[PDB]
Structures are given as structure tokens and as C-alpha cells.
């Protein structure tokens with residue numbers, strides 16, 4: 001069975017931001033979900049569901065997701081984590097405070113993002129930095145091309161000065177959302193084609209000091225950033241390609257060709273990037 | 289008065305969104321302000337990057353002078369930088385929920401909530417449940433009128449919205465904010481001298497641009513002059529009728545005179561541009577508005 005969200009009670013007193021589609025607030029299992037629609041003619045909902053589930057299997061706190069129908073559309077339902085007086089403040093907002101940078105908090109220069117993390121006061125700077133790096137590692141595996149400063153952040157309970165890190169959310173930009181059944185069968189059949197979708201792009205939205213988008217493969221097979229390496233060592237063990245392939249297999253609605261596309265691509269991303277980087281990480285770390 | 293904010297107490301537990309430059313939360317005179325900095329480019333040789341500060345100050349004050357609820361603004365410096373401090377209204381446990389969010393709820397339109405098609409926005413207004421439609425419509429055309437005098441080229445769906453009490457459940461309309469895109473932000477002393485000399489160049493800034501970010505059903509931006517000297521939308525006309533008598537060109541021209549830092553060529557440019565917008569657009573639109581309400 002596939003879920004039908006159509007007749008779930010709509011909450012008319014809530015909306016959500018973002019430009020990437022419509023959202024409504026609705027009740028399901030007696031709890032609030034942010035239901036994200038696609039733009040009418042949906043690969044963004046799929047990626048959202050698969051990816052967040054993959055992020056959960058990695059032991060990272062992430063929003064809970066479901067796929068289901070709603071009238072004419074396939075949509076991903078995301079458990080609302082800003083009910084009960086919780087409020088979401090993106091990293092973009094927090095970076096906007098870094099006034100001595102003379103950069104907008106929307107700019108994704110890596111060094112600046114890290115500077116912002118080291119100088120902010122919502123969250124223990126060291127805790128937050130481990131989070132950010134955990135996320136980059138999971139975004140590497142997922143091939144996330146859009147982790148802009150607006151796509152992560154913090155919850156503040158109302159009436160307090162207290163922040164926690166918010167569940168990972170919006171992974172809709174992960175796992176090749178642009179790929180047709182047609183694009184799939186082509187990538188699987190052409191080695192130079194698949195290779196390019198590991199080594200060349202998707203690339204990370206974070207940029208180096210020459211303003212060039214960060215290449216996942218080039219970056220973490222060459223980085224000497226002890227925090228990034230450490231996060232590789234933290235997370236690698238929690239990758240479970242069986243659980244992951246199983247997530248993909250049990251994904252509702254999705255076509256078998258697309259499933260096959262994600263199986264192969266996730267494996268390739270796992271071996272071509274994570275493994276190579278992780279094996280180097282051990283090597284340097286054992287170096288005493 | 290030019291206020292040095294430099295030693296006011298920072299509040300490190302609050303930040304602010306948007307893409308046009310930095311923001312900090314600080315205490316001034318026992319109250320929280322959102323202090324904005326203009327975006328400073330890597331280089332600004334013979335250009336300005338700093339005008340949005342003044343457009344925000346001067347435009348909000350005019351909106352105040354129009355009797356519409358709007359954020360209080362102060363020009364000042366903070367560590368040797370020009371800023372516009374705007375009294376923080378998401379304090380005392382209010383969240384700002386922008387219209388964009390609300391518009392995102394209108395699934396049946398199959399348009400994104402970022403899209404600014406006028407009929408679609410009017411539809412969102414009629415069908416939302418944050419606020420009595422009638423009250424929201426009125427607020428919306430009042431803002432449009434204000435935005436017509438001020439020449440707002442950027443009233444997108446995230447540049448206005450609602451306040452929700454964190455306690456929660458209910459909304460009121462948020463004060464007008466972000467008027468930084470009004471009053472020819474792209475004008476520097478060179479442009480002002482030019483406009484004040486060449487009337488064709490002033491007229492281009494009356495009849496051709498700025499244009500409303502709002503769009504007609506052909507997907508083009510709404511021209512301020514054409515639209516409200518031609519509209520038969522009763523709600524729009526009714527806002528013109530309410531706002532006209534509140535237009536006090538004295539409070540307005542003084543608001544300008546007493547603006548810090550601005551040059552006498554820039555002050556003169558605003559003085560002139562407001563007279564011109566006031567007479568060529570508003571008066572023209574308002575005169576017809578009176579006429580249509582008449583009887584035989």
C-alpha cells in the first residue's frame with residue numbers, strides 16, 4: 001500500500017518558506033507534517049525521501065519523511081519540527097551577524113562559513129563544527145549540490161535564549177533529481193558519462209578562496225583539515241550499503257530503472273569518493 | 289540625529305535573514321533593533337554601495353508620515369560604518385511569517401509562492417486564513433499606494449507579511465519593512481545632477497521606472513503610472529481615496545531635510561522626485577478616483 005494524504009486535516013494557520021514548490025501544513029498520525037509539493041509538469045520529492053532516510057541510517061538527526069499521494073500529485077511529507085513553540089533560524093541568519101567579514105550570510109565561501117561557526121554564539125562552536133562536517137560527509141555521499149546557508153540551522157524554543165541544532169532538512173537537492181528514466185539508462189551505459197557524475201559534478205555549493213565551487217573528490221582526498229578528516233572517521237563506520245540499498249528498494253512510487261540508477265550511483269559514490277578519502281584519513285591519522 | 293551605536297549592547301542570540309547585507313541585534317534606549325549594513329562589494333571605485341541605508345530610513349519615515357504602520361528607522365554608525373537601525377518587531381515572542389510562506393500554501397494555483405502575479409497574490413489574499421481577507425486586502429492596497437509614491441521596485445512576497453504570537457495560533461499584519469528598494473537607490477550624485485537638468489531623464493523615472501515587482505497576467509511588471517490611472521479595481525481606488533488626504537508634503541520634505549549624510553544634490557533630487565511622483569502619478573490617479581465615485 002501507498003499512503004494517501006489527500007484527506008488529512010489541513011492546518012490553515014501555518015505556511016513555509018522556500019521557492020522550490022508549494023507547501024501545506026497538515027495532520028497525519030495526529031502530528032503536523034510539512035507536505036512539499038512539486039511544480040506541476042517530481043524527482044525532488046523522491047530525492048528528499050531517499051536522502052533523508054539515508055541520512056538517518058548514518059546516525060544523523062534528520063527530519064522524518066514519507067512519500068504519498070495528494071490529489072493529482074506525488075509529494076513528500078516532512079514531519080514538522082517547529083511545532084510546540086519551536087522556531088527555526090537558518091545558518092544564513094546567523095552568518096548575517098559576521099559583520100567584520102564584509103560578506104553576506106548568503107555567501108557560501110567555506111573559510112567564511114567556518115569563521116562564522118567559530119565566532120557564533122547560538123551553539124558551542126566545537127559541537128556545531130562537528131555537525132557541519134558530519135553533514136558535508138553525508139552530502140558528499142548524497143551528491144548534494146545545494147546546501148546553501150538557508151538549508152540548515154537551529155531551533156530556538158520560544159521564551160528562552162536556548163538553541164539546539166535543527167534536524168537536517170531539505171535534502172531535495174541530492175541524488176540526481178534532474179535524471180529521467182532516459183538520463184539514467186544513459187549514465188549506466190556510458191562509463192565516461194557515469195564517471196563525470198562522480199568526479200566532476202554534482203559539486204558542493206561551498207566555495208574555496210578563488211570562489212570556485214568545491215569538488216567533493218578533489219577536496220576530501222586532498223584536505224588536511226583535521227575536522228573534516230575526523231568527521232570522515234566518525235561517519236564512515238555508520239554507512240551501511242545494505243540498509244541503503246534496502247531504503248532505495250522500499251521507496252514507494254519510484255520506477256525500477258530509477259532504483260537501479262540510485263543503487264549503482266550510490267555504490268560508485270561510496271567507493272570512488274568516501275572509501276578513497278576514508279582510507280587516506282586512516283593513513284594520516286595512524287601517522288604518529 | 290546621527291547616533292553612534294558602537295557601544296550599545298550586542299545581543300548575540302538573534303540574527304536576521306535576507307541577502308542585502310549584514311544584520312545585528314542590539315539594545316538602544318532599552319529596546320532591540322535590527323541594525324542593517326549595506327552590502328560592501330570587494331571594490332567600489334566611483335560607485336555607491338551605500339544608498340539602500342538612506343532609502344530605507346527616508347522611505348519608512350514617509351510611510352510613517354502616511355499613517356501606515358511601519359518600522360521606526362534611525363541612521364547612525366556602528367564601528368565607523370553607516371547603518372540603518374530598524375526597531376525590531378519580532379520581539380516579545382512574535383515570529384515574522386512572510387506572505388511568501390502564506391502564498392506557498394495556495395497549492396491549487398500551481399504557481400510558486402515566490403511568484404508575484406497580481407491576480408495570484410489577490411487570490412492568496414482572498415483565500416488565506418491568517419487574517420480576515422477584507423482587512424488584509426485593505427492593508428495590501430494601502431501598501432501599494434505607498435509603494436507608488438515611493439517608487440518601490442522590489443515589494444516581493446517576502447518583503448511583507450504577518451506577526452504570529454509564539455504563544456501562537458494567531459496573526460496580525462506586520463509593520464511595513466524593507467523599504468530599502470524605494471526612492472531610486474541606484475542614484476548617485478552624478479545621476480541626481482543629471483535628472484535635475486534633463487526633464488526627459490526625470491520623466492523616465494516617473495512613467496517608465498521604477499516599476500512594481502507585481503505582474504499582470506501577461507507576466508510583465510505593473511507600471512505604476514499606467515496601472516493606477518487606468519485600474520477599475522475598486523479596492524485599489526479605495527486605498528487611493530484613504531491615503532491621499534494623509535499625504536503631507538511638508539512633513540515629507542522635512543523628513544528629507546533632516547536626513548543625515550545625504551548630499552544637498554541628493555536631497556534636492558528627492559524633494560523634486562517626490563513632488564513629481566506626487567503630482568504626475570498620485571494626483572492624476574486620485575483626481576480620476578474622485579471622478580469615478582461621482583453621480584449624475
Ligand SMILES: Nc1ncnc2c1ncn2[C@@H]1O[C@H](COP(=O)(O)OP(=O)(O)O)[C@@H](O)[C@H]1O
Nearest residue numbers: 016017018019020021063078079080081082170
Ligand atoms: N521538517 C520541517 N519542519 C519545519 N519546518 C521546515 C521543515 N523543513 C523545512 N522547513 C521550513 O520550510 C522551508 C522550505 O523547506 P525546503 O525543503 O527548504 O523547501 P524548498 O526546497 O522549496 O526551499 C525551509 O526553509 C524551512 O524554513
Ligand SMILES: Nc1ncnc2c1ncn2[C@@H]1O[C@H](COP(=O)(O)OP(=O)(O)O)[C@@H](O)[C@H]1O
Nearest residue numbers: 304305306307308359374375376377378465466
Ligand atoms: N523591523 C524588523 N524587526 C524585526 N525583524 C525584521 C525587521 N525587518 C526585517 N526583519 C527580518 O529580517 C530580514 C531581513 O530584513 P530586510 O530589511 O528585508 O533585509 P534585506 O533587504 O537584506 O533582505 C527580513 O526578511 C525579516 O524577516
Ligand SMILES: [Mg+2]
Nearest residue numbers: 018150151170
Ligand atoms: Mg530550501
Ligand SMILES: [Mg+2]
Nearest residue numbers: 306446447466
Ligand atoms: Mg528582504
